[PDB]
Amino acid sequence: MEMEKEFEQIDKSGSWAAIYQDIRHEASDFPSRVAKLPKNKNRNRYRDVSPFDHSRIKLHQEDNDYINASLIKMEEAQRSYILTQGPLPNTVGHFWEMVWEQKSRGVVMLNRVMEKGSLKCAQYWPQKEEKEMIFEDTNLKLTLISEDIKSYYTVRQLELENLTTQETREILHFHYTTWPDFGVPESPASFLNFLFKVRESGSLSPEHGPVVVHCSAGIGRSGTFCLADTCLLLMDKRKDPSSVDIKKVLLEMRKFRMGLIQTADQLRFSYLAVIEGAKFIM
Numbered sequence: 001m002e003m004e005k006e007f008e009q010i011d012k013s014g015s016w017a018a019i020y021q022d023i024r025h026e027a028s029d030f031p032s033r034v035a036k037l038p039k040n041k042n043r044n045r046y047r048d049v050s051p052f053d054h055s056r057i058k059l060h061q062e063d064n065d066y067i068n069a070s071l072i073k074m075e076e077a078q079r080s081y082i083l084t085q086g087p088l089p090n091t092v093g094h095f096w097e098m099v100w101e102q103k104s105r106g107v108v109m110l111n112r113v114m115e116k117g118s119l120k121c122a123q124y125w126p127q128k129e130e131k132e133m134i135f136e137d138t139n140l141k142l143t144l145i146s147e148d149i150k151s152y153y154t155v156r157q158l159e160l161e162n163l164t165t166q167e168t169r170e171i172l173h174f175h176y177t178t179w180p181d182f183g184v185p186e187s188p189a190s191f192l193n194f195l196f197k198v199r200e201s202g203s204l205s206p207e208h209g210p211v212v213v214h215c216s217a218g219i220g221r222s223g224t225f226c227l228a229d230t231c232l233l234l235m236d237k238r239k240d241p242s243s244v245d246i247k248k249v250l251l252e253m254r255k256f257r258m259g260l261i262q263t264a265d266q267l268r269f270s271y272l273a274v275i276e277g278a279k280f281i282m
């Protein structure tokens, strides 16, 4: 079926939970043996969220190459994304090592450091220009260059230096700051505006490594971001845009990371975002 009328048909029939459970039933199951080794217990935020072995990002280290991060490679859309958990106190150095080694331009953050009165990820970037961060385990230096605070999101320019080679690179930090503690946003307008800002920066484009996107676990809000982007790109590329099947795209992405889209409300919000976004594109 088309998207917008399939949408109204699920709303009128109140069957979002059944649609979402079908997706969960049909989703791929691949091994994640490296994530479950005992030496990696303190490298995982949640015991039921792990990268598959076949798609996990490997750190360029001989001691322990593990990080909780997956490469999502969308072949027809010609887009790639790295989805990862919010960094932990003992993995902030690993995080910036991955950004360096994979040649990423942008980092997309979809959570606040504290939500619901608890810490959802480490404070992994510097908050003042004159107070830079040094990660001694991975030999990197990170400096805040500028910050632009808007009503729904903040964009930061960062400098990442590899202290071993003295090479430097500019990283863009796109921080969506207004996703509600509970539930999903009522309108997709600010989320779409944010996606378009990431796009306009060049961070999603083939001349750079894959964008790094995270929330707390790296599957819920993160999944929404890449699902909406990929669906809108396919609607532009194809002769028949109504052929784009958001459930099929989601199942394809779930071949690369488990659990993408965590609730039926997130599923409905993804439909809403693609629907409204398709109108603005033209």
Ligand SMILES: Cn1c(N)nc2ccccc21
Residues within 6 Å of the ligand: 042, 043, 044, 045, 046, 088, 089, 090
């Ligand atoms: C899961 N986890 C949390 N929540 N805090 C951590 C600190 C160190 C290592 C692991 C941690």
